[PDB]
Amino acid sequence: HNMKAFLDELKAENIKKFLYNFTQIPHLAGTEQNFQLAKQIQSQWKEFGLDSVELAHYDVLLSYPNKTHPNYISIINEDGNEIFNTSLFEPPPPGYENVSDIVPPFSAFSPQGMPEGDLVYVNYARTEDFFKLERDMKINCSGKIVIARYGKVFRGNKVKNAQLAGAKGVILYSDPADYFAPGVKSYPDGWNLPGGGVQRGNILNLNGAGDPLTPGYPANEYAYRRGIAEAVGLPSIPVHPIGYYDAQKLLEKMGGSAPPDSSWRGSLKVPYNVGPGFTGNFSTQKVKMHIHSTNEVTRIYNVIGTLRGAVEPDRYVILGGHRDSWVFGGIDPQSGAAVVHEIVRSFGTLKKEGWRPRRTILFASWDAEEFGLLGSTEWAEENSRLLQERGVAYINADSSIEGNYTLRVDCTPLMYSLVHNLTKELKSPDEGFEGKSLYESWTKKSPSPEFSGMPRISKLGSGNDFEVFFQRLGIASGRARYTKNWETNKFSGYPLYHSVYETYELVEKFYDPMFKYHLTVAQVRGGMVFELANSIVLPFDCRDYAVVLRKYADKIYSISMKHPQEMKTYSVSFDSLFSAVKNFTEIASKFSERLQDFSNPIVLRMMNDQLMFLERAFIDPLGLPDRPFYRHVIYAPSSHNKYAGESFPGIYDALFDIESKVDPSKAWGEVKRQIYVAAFTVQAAAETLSEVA
Amino acid sequence: HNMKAFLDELKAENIKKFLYNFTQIPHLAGTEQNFQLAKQIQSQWKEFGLDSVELAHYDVLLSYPNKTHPNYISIINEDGNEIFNTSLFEPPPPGYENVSDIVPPFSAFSPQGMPEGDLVYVNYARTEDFFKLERDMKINCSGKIVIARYGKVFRGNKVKNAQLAGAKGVILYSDPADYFAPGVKSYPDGWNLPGGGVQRGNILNLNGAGDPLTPGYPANEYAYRRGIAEAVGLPSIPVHPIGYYDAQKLLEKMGGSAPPDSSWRGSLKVPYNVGPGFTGNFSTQKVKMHIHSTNEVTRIYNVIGTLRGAVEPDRYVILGGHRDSWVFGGIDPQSGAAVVHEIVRSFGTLKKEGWRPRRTILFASWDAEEFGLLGSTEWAEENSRLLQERGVAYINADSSIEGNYTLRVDCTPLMYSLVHNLTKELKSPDEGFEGKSLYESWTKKSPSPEFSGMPRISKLGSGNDFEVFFQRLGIASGRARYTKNWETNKFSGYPLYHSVYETYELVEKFYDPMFKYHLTVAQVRGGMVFELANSIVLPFDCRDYAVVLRKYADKIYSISMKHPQEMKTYSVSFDSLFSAVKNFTEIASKFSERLQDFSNPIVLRMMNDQLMFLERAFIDPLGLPDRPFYRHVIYAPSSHNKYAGESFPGIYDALFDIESKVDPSKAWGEVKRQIYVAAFTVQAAAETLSEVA
Numbered sequence A, B: 001h002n003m004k005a006f007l008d009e010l011k012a013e014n015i016k017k018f019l020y021n022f023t024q025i026p027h028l029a030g031t032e033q034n035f036q037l038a039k040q041i042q043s044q045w046k047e048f049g050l051d052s053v054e055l056a057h058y059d060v061l062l063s064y065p066n067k068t069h070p071n072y073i074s075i076i077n078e079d080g081n082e083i084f085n086t087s088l089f090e091p092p093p094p095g096y097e098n099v100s101d102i103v104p105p106f107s108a109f110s111p112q113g114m115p116e117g118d119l120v121y122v123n124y125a126r127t128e129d130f131f132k133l134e135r136d137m138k139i140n141c142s143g144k145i146v147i148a149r150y151g152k153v154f155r156g157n158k159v160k161n162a163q164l165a166g167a168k169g170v171i172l173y174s175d176p177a178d179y180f181a182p183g184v185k186s187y188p189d190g191w192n193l194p195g196g197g198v199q200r201g202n203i204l205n206l207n208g209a210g211d212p213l214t215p216g217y218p219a220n221e222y223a224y225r226r227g228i229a230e231a232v233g234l235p236s237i238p239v240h241p242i243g244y245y246d247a248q249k250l251l252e253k254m255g256g257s258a259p260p261d262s263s264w265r266g267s268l269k270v271p272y273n274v275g276p277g278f279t280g281n282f283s284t285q286k287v288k289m290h291i292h293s294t295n296e297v298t299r300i301y302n303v304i305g306t307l308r309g310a311v312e313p314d315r316y317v318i319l320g321g322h323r324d325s326w327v328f329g330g331i332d333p334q335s336g337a338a339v340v341h342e343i344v345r346s347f348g349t350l351k352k353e354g355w356r357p358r359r360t361i362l363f364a365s366w367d368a369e370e371f372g373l374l375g376s377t378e379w380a381e382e383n384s385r386l387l388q389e390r391g392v393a394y395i396n397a398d399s400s401i402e403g404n405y406t407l408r409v410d411c412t413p414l415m416y417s418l419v420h421n422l423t424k425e426l427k428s429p430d431e432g433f434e435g436k437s438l439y440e441s442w443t444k445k446s447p448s449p450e451f452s453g454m455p456r457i458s459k460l461g462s463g464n465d466f467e468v469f470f471q472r473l474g475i476a477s478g479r480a481r482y483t484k485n486w487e488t489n490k491f492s493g494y495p496l497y498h499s500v501y502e503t504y505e506l507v508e509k510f511y512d513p514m515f516k517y518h519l520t521v522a523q524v525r526g527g528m529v530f531e532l533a534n535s536i537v538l539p540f541d542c543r544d545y546a547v548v549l550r551k552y553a554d555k556i557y558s559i560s561m562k563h564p565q566e567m568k569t570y571s572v573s574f575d576s577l578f579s580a581v582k583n584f585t586e587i588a589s590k591f592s593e594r595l596q597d598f599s600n601p602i603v604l605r606m607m608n609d610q611l612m613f614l615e616r617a618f619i620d621p622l623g624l625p626d627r628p629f630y631r632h633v634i635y636a637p638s639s640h641n642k643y644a645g646e647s648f649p650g651i652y653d654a655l656f657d658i659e660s661k662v663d664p665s666k667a668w669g670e671v672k673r674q675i676y677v678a679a680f681t682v683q684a685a686a687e688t689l690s691e692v693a
């Protein structure tokens, strides 16, 4: 009854069976079908042997198209005749043409409206794309409809950026440059996005809030709800996504300015002119959106399973991933949910033979992740006091695969050593690495840029259910999946992401026929949970935080040093931050020696508490500026791209575009304030590792 | 080596000697003399046997009069001649007439200015006093100098209230009605305030912030400081305190309206007319303030002593009280600091014989309490992560006596049972209770209004160093001292409070000749620390929180029920709050049964963690509205009087004066929001006491 027993019990064939089972019908958040699946998972987790399995429900703001009043976009003429209309639905894949309740493509939480106007093309609608338009090209987006390609950044940031440029609507589309890999065929004959394929997805800017109506508090039965006008994170302009056949029709007539360079050009046979408006012959034609989606408070259901710890039942190791999907969820999330299902089954097999983990393991099937991480966040808001005093670690479990090339791990530095050690004990599933470790194949394919013989591990970003646990509550968090080769593949994510084409057959035919990558990911996620829940000493190495803190302090200093004159004028010093990082390094080294040197369960648990509370020490209860639910001082989601992690975010944002601020004394004063905050937090975290008295 | 050993070692004669030692010269915060005393205490605590004794220093905003440009108030005539001037200093007491560095009376943090105008008399400058003036009497304070009697509420609230009435200056004075007990003589021949006596004291409204320049973060060497204009809590109008000889001269000429009733009349031979301005003959005479005090960043020093725990060194029981005084500090704080000194000495005697407490005891000598709880708050800001994960309890130790009648205890419900049990084991020092317990004399003199055979224990308010620990960090807190009979004594506090007359001789001659009340208070404070630090199971009873929660829910409901029509119109229900309190009651009862029913140190410590984190569960990380450092949802300092505790403060303030709000739908919506917040927090606290898995 050890990790090997746990790991050997996991079966590729089981994951395949569960994935099939979870992907036959859509499981849209807030729908009857997703409630039925919740009840199925609850029943089976009970069957598998968990001690208790409960549903936790909340009533949250969701968004749905109007079934009898469809969303679409038109090219209109001067008479007001609609001469081109975008599609009302994606052509369903082979054998699914009779499946009902496929939600048509839409941007969740768009307001209603029917704006008409001239088109401006804004590339990826990134902060720098808008800088280039407004500052360099002198193109004014005010009162224009903007058309943006999907890719590079979270779509919620694209919409915020368009809104602040004064756009009156946004059209998102999938360019073949970003969603069509050269030499591969469109679904169903390969894994590429067809011209009729469209990416669904919410366009909120919640900054960690959870349910737009109840920031701070769970959306329970007696919750007081904000009115819509005071809701968190809703867009103020209509937004709608389209495929590249339709996008070609909207872009082909574009006039005004040429694209400023080749990074603005996708792969369609159009000029990619920025606009505004169409070329001479068509200059009186306009674009008109028709958006009739509604926001509605709707009940959602999380499944929470508990496997009580034998020795420390009041210490929680959490394995969590979502269950709601946009349509069939063939990759996102059911490739993860099937992996979780099999992990529960394996742990339950051990439990039935009389085993218990040392610490309590909690298993979660989250709802409404696609609509803003709503299920995980309301649950964490309800249980925040238990989680912050008892939460050892959170391992996420969304999509198990986004490619078939190598492992991808994003996690806290506290988990680096755990991950290196676990992957050295696992077999590589890769062709050409037969009989070699996962560590060896991963390190070869994804080398660390700093250290030879080590693999690359990314900072956690966001856009997934670990956000409340890590950046709000400061619980050590990690995620792992199989991924593509980013070096040779210039497309954003996997092409069929959030489309009707993301099916069981996509996975079985193209991504993972033998379910070996799925099994490898179940071993990594399950193996991490196993060690976190069973190791006598928590498997965190504080010294790994010291190394990265120095790297981040060097990076942020280098950013500031682009402005040597202002650093002189305003006496901007990084000395305190470096001092704190030096101290952290020294105290962590001493703590590590003591951890190696002690039959005393109180000393042990005292030191396990120091390990557990170390991630917690990086939380500032005041939050980051205007983002009160991003409280971790070392890591926040980038303010320009929710998917990407940023280090020392408070200082990073204080420095960003600082040369453009009208009051440099004020701007540099805020840089200095954020330096103080960061140095203090690092020192305070370091001091939690000092001898306690 | 038990509590009896500890308690028997404490000596009245030692406390007397220490009090003498601490009160020969002034120990104003930020002065050399108070730094010297800090070093003396550090040396002696080392000598007494503590494991380590450190100074923790901060650089905080303090306030001092200008030595070469004195503060005073004048009656001026139409020519501009100053025909009456208030005193520049209090007549020094017998034998102290040559003591240097007695700070003259002033209001700390007053801005500078020389405003001239007509006087309005505003009674105690309470919220209801201003309601009566503006709403009922139709007297406009805008551009007037207000004169207010000290008493009833914290002076910072008086100043805020005058400021919001549009006053251009405030004059505070001590009326004999409030500071002269009938039949007792003025200092030095009794304990009454003489006509030349004046009460010093800060006039900030910090709402828990600590140093005005660094809210959230310790005022360390590299701190970024707000500019003065953005500082927390500073008054915007000049303020100065005077004695009743001077007040008589300012009040005797008052004209305009008569006092509205007898509750507006003090004891001086003047009419107590509200004004504005003087009676006919003197109507062209005006009042002029001259305030030249300066705010200055100044270094302060806390002494922190550690007695490391034998079994749980990572669990902290804190005994803390301040050392800085306005002048000699004969009662405030040195009657407390002498008691702490003797407690350290007794614990140290046991330690030298080989004993250690189970948990770590921290001893604190705080600085700058008189200037806004600055020393305790900066230290807690620096050490917040250690305190919130390890802080068992905080026992305050300011003035040991404010009367000689009976015991006064204000504490969390979690300490009620501890206090009842300890006082049953202590001898009463009272005349007529020889051979009886302290519990018996206390209960007889101060009966609980709810329960026969029980003593009254007040809610914690504020205006002392427990504020950061309790209302910011949610560490279980208590205080105890000897007090007067409030039923038969209508004067506010003790008469010589914060005056030069508060001396060693005041205490030795009038309050506590035999030092028996001091010894009784050392036994209570020390006995509490002893039990908290040594009891195997933490000596908190969660069921006592359940009883008070019901009492507070009844009270707040009763307030709302004065508005039955609005409760109907806006569907205002308290059902959720009562449900949560019912649940808390049931879960606490079950938790208590389990606590009685378990050789297992993990179960024990798990349950000790549940006990320790129960106060912590009442913290809301978002704080109360516009008071981010008041985070406890059950108890905050009253928004009308910092000294008084308010229960369910969020709901209380939402309901306060609600009939006057211009938008009732908005106002009642906020009542409902605060009901939701309170119900949720109570339920979430209850759930920390549930089985953990």
Ligand SMILES: *[C@@H]1O[C@H](CO)[C@@H](O[C@@H]2O[C@H](CO)[C@@H](O[C@@H]3O[C@H](CO[C@H]4O[C@H](CO)[C@@H](O)[C@H](O)[C@@H]4O)[C@@H](O)[C@H](O[C@H]4O[C@H](CO)[C@@H](O)[C@H](O)[C@@H]4O)[C@@H]3O)[C@H](O)[C@H]2NC(C)=O)[C@H](O)[C@H]1NC(C)=O
Residues within 6 Å of the ligand: A054, A055, A056, A057, A221, A222, B576, B577, B579, B580, B583, B679, B680, B683
């Ligand atoms: C004091 O403690 C008790 C626990 O003993 C709490 O009681 C809960 O109260 C809420 C009501 O506020 C109940 O919520 C209701 O749940 C129903 C489904 O519950 C099932 O599933 C749960 C676990 O997932 C089981 O524990 C439970 O036994 C059931 O099997 C919903 O169907 C209800 O919604 C319907 O009615 C309401 C009200 O009319 C409508 O608004 C809805 O639209 C809907 O039609 C409802 O949500 C909950 O079941 C109770 N729990 C238990 C264990 O009994 C109190 O909440 C607590 N007080 C506070 C302040 O927390």
Ligand SMILES: *[C@@H]1O[C@H](CO)[C@@H](O[C@@H]2O[C@H](CO)[C@@H](O[C@@H]3O[C@H](CO[C@H]4O[C@H](CO)[C@@H](O)[C@H](O)[C@@H]4O)[C@@H](O)[C@H](O[C@H]4O[C@H](CO)[C@@H](O)[C@H](O)[C@@H]4O)[C@@H]3O)[C@H](O)[C@H]2NC(C)=O)[C@H](O)[C@H]1NC(C)=O
Residues within 6 Å of the ligand: A576, A577, A579, A580, A583, A679, A680, A683, B054, B055, B056, B057, B221, B222
């Ligand atoms: C990394 O870790 C080290 C600890 O090893 C910290 O070092 C401390 O650094 C501060 C400076 O920022 C030092 O502060 C100075 O303290 C002097 C008095 O210290 C005495 O008392 C303490 C305990 O109370 C003892 O530990 C210490 O050994 C001394 O006996 C002050 O006199 C200094 O102030 C004077 O100089 C400054 C600077 O020129 C002026 O602005 C002042 O006006 C004043 O004249 C100063 O405040 C502290 O002593 C150091 N501690 C130790 C134990 O060595 C770093 O702070 C830490 N990094 C971070 C970011 O926290």
Ligand SMILES: *[C@@H]1O[C@H](CO[C@@H]2O[C@@H](C)[C@@H](O)[C@@H](O)[C@@H]2O)[C@@H](O[C@@H]2O[C@H](CO)[C@@H](O[C@@H]3O[C@H](CO)[C@@H](O)[C@H](O)[C@@H]3O)[C@H](O)[C@H]2NC(C)=O)[C@H](O)[C@H]1NC(C)=O
Residues within 6 Å of the ligand: A070, A072, A080, A081, A082, A083, A084, A085, A088
């Ligand atoms: C693009 O789509 C518009 C609107 O069409 C409507 O909405 C879509 C989402 C689909 O669900 C359609 O099935 C749905 O009709 C088209 O413009 C519309 O054309 C229709 C038919 O010509 C007009 O309806 C009526 O026409 C008859 C003529 O006999 C009259 O008796 C009625 O009085 C009424 O006018 C309708 O007015 C018009 N609507 C708008 C908003 O313009 C458009 O033809 C189509 N363009 C294409 C396919 O190129």
Ligand SMILES: *[C@@H]1O[C@H](CO[C@@H]2O[C@@H](C)[C@@H](O)[C@@H](O)[C@@H]2O)[C@@H](O[C@@H]2O[C@H](CO)[C@@H](O[C@@H]3O[C@H](CO)[C@@H](O)[C@H](O)[C@@H]3O)[C@H](O)[C@H]2NC(C)=O)[C@H](O)[C@H]1NC(C)=O
Residues within 6 Å of the ligand: B070, B072, B080, B081, B082, B083, B084, B085, B088
């Ligand atoms: C109330 O106090 C004022 C001001 O007095 C000054 O401040 C106090 C706090 C004390 O420290 C005083 O010692 C200090 O002087 C008095 O008004 C002031 O009176 C003096 C003397 O009459 C004036 O100074 C000078 O007078 C000589 C006359 O020979 C001239 O040569 C000088 O040019 C100069 O005027 C001073 O102007 C005047 N100041 C003001 C602000 O009014 C006031 O007499 C006193 N009232 C009492 C005791 O009833």
Ligand SMILES: *[C@@H]1O[C@H](CO)[C@@H](O[C@@H]2O[C@H](CO)[C@@H](O[C@@H]3O[C@H](CO)[C@@H](O)[C@H](O)[C@@H]3O)[C@H](O)[C@H]2NC(C)=O)[C@H](O)[C@H]1NC(C)=O
Residues within 6 Å of the ligand: A020, A021, A022, A024, A039, A040, A043, A044
């Ligand atoms: C995915 O897998 C689950 C679990 O195997 C399937 O649900 C299960 O379906 C069977 C057959 O429909 C159910 O048994 C039936 O019970 C009813 C009475 O409740 C009875 O009338 C039938 O004769 C039969 O015995 C079973 O209840 C159900 N189990 C759970 C836990 O829900 C599900 O159908 C699969 N979905 C797909 C799309 O393959």
Ligand SMILES: *[C@@H]1O[C@H](CO)[C@@H](O[C@@H]2O[C@H](CO)[C@@H](O[C@@H]3O[C@H](CO)[C@@H](O)[C@H](O)[C@@H]3O)[C@H](O)[C@H]2NC(C)=O)[C@H](O)[C@H]1NC(C)=O
Residues within 6 Å of the ligand: A417, A418, A421, A538, A539, A540, A541, A596, A597
């Ligand atoms: C990942 O695996 C590495 C390598 O096994 C782990 O580091 C090793 O941990 C062991 C156990 O603490 C260390 O052993 C100690 O050695 C010293 C003798 O120098 C002795 O004082 C102790 O009693 C103990 O035997 C070992 O030194 C150490 N090896 C290295 C190279 O660091 C690491 O802990 C694992 N990481 C996690 C998170 O589990």
Ligand SMILES: *[C@@H]1O[C@H](CO)[C@@H](O[C@@H]2O[C@H](CO)[C@@H](O[C@@H]3O[C@H](CO)[C@@H](O)[C@H](O)[C@@H]3O)[C@H](O)[C@H]2NC(C)=O)[C@H](O)[C@H]1NC(C)=O
Residues within 6 Å of the ligand: B020, B021, B022, B024, B039, B040, B043, B044
């Ligand atoms: C309050 O009590 C303290 C502690 O008893 C007194 O401080 C102590 O004073 C004595 C006598 O001044 C000091 O001893 C002296 O040391 C110096 C050299 O440092 C030497 O020149 C003298 O001959 C003598 O031995 C002692 O250092 C000092 N102790 C401490 C811990 O500060 C203090 O004077 C008392 N204050 C009052 C107002 O009574």
Ligand SMILES: *[C@@H]1O[C@H](CO)[C@@H](O[C@@H]2O[C@H](CO)[C@@H](O[C@@H]3O[C@H](CO)[C@@H](O)[C@H](O)[C@@H]3O)[C@H](O)[C@H]2NC(C)=O)[C@H](O)[C@H]1NC(C)=O
Residues within 6 Å of the ligand: B417, B418, B421, B538, B539, B540, B541, B596, B597
């Ligand atoms: C203050 O003192 C009271 C009275 O001594 C303490 O309550 C008493 O606590 C003891 C020890 O837990 C209880 O004894 C238990 O009795 C049951 C038998 O019914 C048994 O199951 C247990 O093994 C244990 O012997 C006793 O019942 C209880 N008495 C009352 C009247 O409640 C109280 O705990 C003290 N408070 C603090 C904070 O220490």
Ligand SMILES: *[C@@H]1O[C@H](CO)[C@@H](O[C@@H]2O[C@H](CO)[C@@H](O)[C@H](O)[C@H]2NC(C)=O)[C@H](O)[C@H]1NC(C)=O
Residues within 6 Å of the ligand: A066, A067, A068, A069, A292, A294
């Ligand atoms: C979906 O859109 C339709 C419009 O086609 C909405 O139905 C109309 O709503 C208005 C205002 O409430 C009524 O006056 C009309 O009588 C309705 N028309 C029809 C044809 O039913 C409908 O409310 C929307 N549905 C949802 C669920 O929001």
Ligand SMILES: *[C@@H]1O[C@H](CO)[C@@H](O[C@@H]2O[C@H](CO)[C@@H](O)[C@H](O)[C@H]2NC(C)=O)[C@H](O)[C@H]1NC(C)=O
Residues within 6 Å of the ligand: B066, B067, B068, B069, B292, B294
């Ligand atoms: C105390 O008050 C005096 C005024 O009597 C201040 O001293 C004057 O300050 C101004 C402006 O800085 C100078 O121009 C004068 O020359 C000073 N006068 C004298 C007589 O010295 C003084 O700054 C104040 N002191 C403090 C510590 O704030």
Ligand SMILES: *[C@@H]1O[C@H](CO)[C@@H](O)[C@H](O)[C@H]1NC(C)=O
Residues within 6 Å of the ligand: A140, A141, A142, A143
């Ligand atoms: C862009 O256009 C709007 C409306 O026509 C105008 O008010 C705004 O000032 C313009 N902004 C710039 C930067 O040119």
Ligand SMILES: *[C@@H]1O[C@H](CO)[C@@H](O)[C@H](O)[C@H]1NC(C)=O
Residues within 6 Å of the ligand: A191, A403, A404, A484, A510, A511
């Ligand atoms: C799977 O791997 C092969 C071999 O490298 C590659 O050519 C193919 O494109 C991969 N499939 C997917 C879906 O990434």
Ligand SMILES: *[C@@H]1O[C@H](CO)[C@@H](O)[C@H](O)[C@H]1NC(C)=O
Residues within 6 Å of the ligand: B140, B141, B142, B143
């Ligand atoms: C009080 O007086 C001021 C200034 O003379 C005036 O502006 C203000 O409106 C008055 N307020 C009331 C309530 O009468």
Ligand SMILES: *[C@@H]1O[C@H](CO)[C@@H](O)[C@H](O)[C@H]1NC(C)=O
Residues within 6 Å of the ligand: B191, B403, B404, B484, B510, B511
């Ligand atoms: C001390 O107690 C006596 C007897 O009750 C009382 O008359 C006297 O006023 C008290 N002294 C003080 C300072 O309260």
Ligand SMILES: [Ca+2]
Residues within 6 Å of the ligand: A209, A210, A211, A213, A214, A215, A216, A217, A218, A219, A377, A378, A381
């Ligand atoms: Ca919420």
Ligand SMILES: [Ca+2]
Residues within 6 Å of the ligand: B209, B210, B211, B213, B214, B215, B216, B217, B218, B219, B377, B378, B381
């Ligand atoms: Ca501060």
